[PDB]
Amino acid sequence: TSHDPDSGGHFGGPSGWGGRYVPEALMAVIEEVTAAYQKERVSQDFLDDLDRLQANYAGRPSPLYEATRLSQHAGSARIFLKREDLNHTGSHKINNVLGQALLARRMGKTRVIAETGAGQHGVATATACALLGLDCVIYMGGIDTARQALNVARMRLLGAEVVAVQTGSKTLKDAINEAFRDWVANADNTYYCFGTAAGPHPFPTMVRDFQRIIGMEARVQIQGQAGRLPDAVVACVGGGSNAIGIFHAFLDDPGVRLVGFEAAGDGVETGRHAATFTAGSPGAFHGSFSYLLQDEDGQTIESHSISAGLDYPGVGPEHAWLKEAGRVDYRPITDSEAMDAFGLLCRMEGIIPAIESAHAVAGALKLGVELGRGAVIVVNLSGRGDKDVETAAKWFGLL
Amino acid sequence: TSHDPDSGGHFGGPSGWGGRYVPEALMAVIEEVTAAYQKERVSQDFLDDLDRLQANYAGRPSPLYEATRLSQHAGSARIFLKREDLNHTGSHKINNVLGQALLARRMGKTRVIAETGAGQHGVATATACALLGLDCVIYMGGIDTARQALNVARMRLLGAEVVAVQTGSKTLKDAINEAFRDWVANADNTYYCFGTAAGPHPFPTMVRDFQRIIGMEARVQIQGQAGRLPDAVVACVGGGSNAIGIFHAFLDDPGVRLVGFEAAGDGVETGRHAATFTAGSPGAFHGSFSYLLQDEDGQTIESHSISAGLDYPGVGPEHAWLKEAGRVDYRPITDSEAMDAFGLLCRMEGIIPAIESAHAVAGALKLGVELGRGAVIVVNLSGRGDKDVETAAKWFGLL
Amino acid sequence: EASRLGPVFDSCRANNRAALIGYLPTGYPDVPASVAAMTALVESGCDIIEVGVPYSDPGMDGPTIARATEAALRGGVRVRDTLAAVEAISIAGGRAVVMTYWNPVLRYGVDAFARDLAAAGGLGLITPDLIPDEAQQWLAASEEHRLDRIFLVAPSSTPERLAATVEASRGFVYAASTMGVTGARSQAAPELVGRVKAVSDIPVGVGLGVRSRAQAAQIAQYADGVIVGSALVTALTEGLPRLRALTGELAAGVRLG
Amino acid sequence: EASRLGPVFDSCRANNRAALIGYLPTGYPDVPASVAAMTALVESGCDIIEVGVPYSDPGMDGPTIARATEAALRGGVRVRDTLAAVEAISIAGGRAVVMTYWNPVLRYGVDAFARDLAAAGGLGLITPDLIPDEAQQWLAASEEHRLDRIFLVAPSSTPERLAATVEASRGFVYAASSQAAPELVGRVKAVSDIPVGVGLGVRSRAQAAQIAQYADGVIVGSALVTALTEGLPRLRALTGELAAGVRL
Ligand SMILES: C=C(NCc1c(COP(=O)(O)O)cnc(C)c1O)C(=O)O
Ligand SMILES: C=C(NCc1c(COP(=O)(O)O)cnc(C)c1O)C(=O)O
């Protein structure tokens, strides 16, 4: 609780970051979800149910692997990969989904809806709903259905309805808008399983609480394998769930640097990026007061990235607060930098990462050069790259 | 041990299952590999290296999951899934590959070759070779390259060369033939990383020794979760590696039924199957004396299955021995049965299995109805279904 | 003292009718045509005009309004064009409130936007994604610049939240029938108005996807104002004469003796 | 007392030459044509004929032989057709051995195949996928039905395994593969006086002559199949050229 927001969902004071910038039509169900979560987060039977699924279904704990063959590309620093790529469904998304799906059942909801960009949250949600016998509808931007088609097919096999969103940029922000519209209309029976650490209270806190396990495990593992706390912990930042998940356990370790890496696309100078902290500014978007990419009038600027999971012009409010506090540094990584790292990891360690995660790996390599020989850097390897194989093969001229 | 063959590779004495039916041209390298294995299997440095990789890289142990929503479809029996699907690369193949790849490096070999049908062994081999910096060439039947195309692209991204084999049935047996010819020509520098529990000595024993970890984990896990040894342990059977891996630790527990399920394709009566034990007979093929599908003159009959991994007319010699002894029963499962189970596992447990593994699940459902309420059945869930999503979506009319 | 929109509702209630509240988005089909359209609403008998601020991600707008706001943004519409629209409405003898999502207001500056809206003759602000829980700055700016604050209530609203939302509102409370976009063609609306009347005497405007005289008349039996949006946009797309005719039919609907 | 092929190699060694050993697969392009081709080899001066048994998965066969055996199998060739081929060769005055992968022999019955091979006038068996380590049944059948047993050695063969393979062989040793062939023949000569045949993808008269300088037999197969595919006259011409090659 030291790092938690107030009862209104605000970080850093009464007007700060987060809150609930939603219509009154959603407030009954938002208050219903908030009350249900406050009740269940302190119920041992709930935590036991979540733990049992984490262990036996999802295969936790995920291991921590020292990628020694990266060292020479990282200034002889020691890169440790936190292997969320090995989870059921292939990403960290399943952690949050199991929690929220269990909560949906506890609340008596019969229908679950979700947004997805990379399709990993969509697949995770479909997975949990199949497991728990819930009806499932996934909203996905039309551009994303085409570039993450493996995940569309998986969702469909799992019994989910997939709705391709054609509005706006046809990517994650637009999928979120449609899912929101569904929830407004169907609040009585429908639970909205939100997939990142953004949105109105209680979502930033709840999503973060279910992703905390990553950091809790990593903090124990790194002390065991390296003999000490790391010099840095790093992750990629879409809306912010995998990053906040791994960071949280190290917040009160003052010697541990925390670095989030955001998608810079073609470059921050080009206007084709998703570098929210580098190029954005404070505003109200998708339920929260946080940073977003916006023009002089406050219109959302459409994001671009080769990574569908980082192609989002906003970011979660806890990250905005941590940025303002000076606790986390957030830095841009381009498409090219990320793909170089994607390729390097395949070639050197035999791990095919998600293109999202390759941004974190790319950032870690640069940080390694900065910190130098023997520095211990823990990297959240948020997911695997099966969905991205076609894109990557094309990038590297392998068909 | 009690279950090992003699120094010539024969199981069961004088019947002679196994052995070495190879040309003299291969015997120098076969004897080289045999000697290197015998040396390294008792070297603590080697076992430490293998262990470190299994834990931190591959993510062992895999969990054991009670699939309670399957129970009503299995006569109210209790189906426990041994989750090899959650391993790095998405199957059991990685277990054997890390062992053999470490061994290749110990021997000073600079080139690794492998056959693949489903592409999982190919991907695992490529993975290990990336990790250890070995040149890699994978042989894959042309029909398999088309129906497991996701794995071809993964192999290529991992830095492996892939050679499409167009001879014979253009499936696993033909890939094996080509890899064999490569080894004959390039024995001095090349290690053959054989992916199943068949072949000449030492491969059946060595592959099984590296896969034994599955059963050893399962035997401990089931006693922990269920409070006793299972009533049965079951697996699908291609050449036999995942089955022998999970079975081995239960061989000396007399109350534990062991059932292998082989691919019956369109049905055993149709001549379009891979049901080696059901329809085959003893013979020498691919380096061993074991069972194979063969005609009246001893010509190999081409196998057929919807599953690329089980589409092999042979089977490993240790299985022939266990069948002869009456320790394991081997039963046919059709394409249709397997796909029904595929779909059921998706809908009930949110797990997308490999079509290979779906055969084992289908068999488990039938065995559950035989054994009845409360019977404890451990099923080896050998792989995940990423590679099969297109096939399955097409099967279920989901496009 | 009294709300800015108080005299309009008192005047309507004295003539045994509801107020006709008409929505158009600034910049559709372009900026000059939209201003001409809003002027036409004043001339055709709209008591209050909701000047919509086009937003890039309008979660509560229906398809008709969403396509129109997209088109406005492609045309290059700006937030200050909405202030110009309010001026033109005020000059024509009309009464304007602004409907906007909150971020354009934050970006402009809450105090500054309230100041400039009041300077243009604007009477208040409708805030579909701002709940009273987050409205501290807006409440202060609203009191300082004498602007009405129209929050929304929904059928799902709990007793507590409904009471708190009505208490926080000045001018009128917008009750709507849930899903995004103007209503198009159920006892939810009278029930919701009924719940607002049980705790307060503030006027209640009702939005229900109204498209015809008959629907406006039904709503005027129980509601103090009839809110129309989607149908006005559809009318304007066909032409300015079609808008005048429709507005005239709705103006007849709100009157009932 | 002595091997079945011993008098052939002694007769060659007395005429200061190597034996020409010719391989054709039974049933290519069909069964009657293949027998007519094998007869042509006897007439064109092949000292020994290797009658190939087409196998469905021929691991050691190169592309030319593999495609021919595939074609023979499509045509419906049977193991008995090989025994008929051996008989026709023997009646024509030729000397035949059978080359086969092991499973067809197991299926037939090892003893029964030996018995029937011997009754057809067959002199022995070449076994590319049978090492002595697995050859217990074959050794017994070989001794009983008086058949030569030609095992293969390779450049990679260890000293111990080379010795064991040569010791287990009767008739000749098939040395299969730059300077590798003469070196391998040299290593067999150092432990035994058994004749050594060399198979090296021989295509021409000059190549057969080079091999005849050190080897007791020159084995030709791929080139004979290629010749037969063009025509039966082309096979005669090539076989006659190779016959001249071994006499230098
Ligand atoms: C947006 C989606 N994924 C984002 C994602 C991210 C970025 O999202 P975070 O919420 O910042 O963790 C990182 N890694 C992987 C493997 C991802 O799939 C999605 O799948 O719906
Ligand atoms: C033959 C190959 N796979 C076989 C396979 C099998 C059958 O092979 P076994 O050797 O019987 O375990 C089972 N499960 C999975 C997931 C598989 O991929 C291959 O990928 O090369």
Residue numbers in the entry:
A (entry chain B), B (entry chain D): 9 to 407
C (entry chain A): 8 to 192, 196 to 267
D (entry chain C): 8 to 184, 196 to 266
What did the article's authors report about this structure?
Tryptophan synthase, composed of a heterotetramer of TrpA and TrpB subunits, catalyzes the final step in tryptophan biosynthesis. The α-subunit cleaves indole-3-glycerol phosphate to indole and glycerophosphate, the former diffusing to the active site of the β-subunit where it is covalently bound to l-serine forming l-tryptophan in a PLP-dependent oxidation/reduction reaction. Communication between the two sites enables the activities to be coordinated, preventing the escape of indole and enabling this product of the α-subunit to be channeled through a hydrophobic tunnel to the β-subunit. In this work, we have recognized the potential of an exciting novel anti-tubercular drug target, tryptophan synthase, which catalyzes the final step in tryptophan biosynthesis.
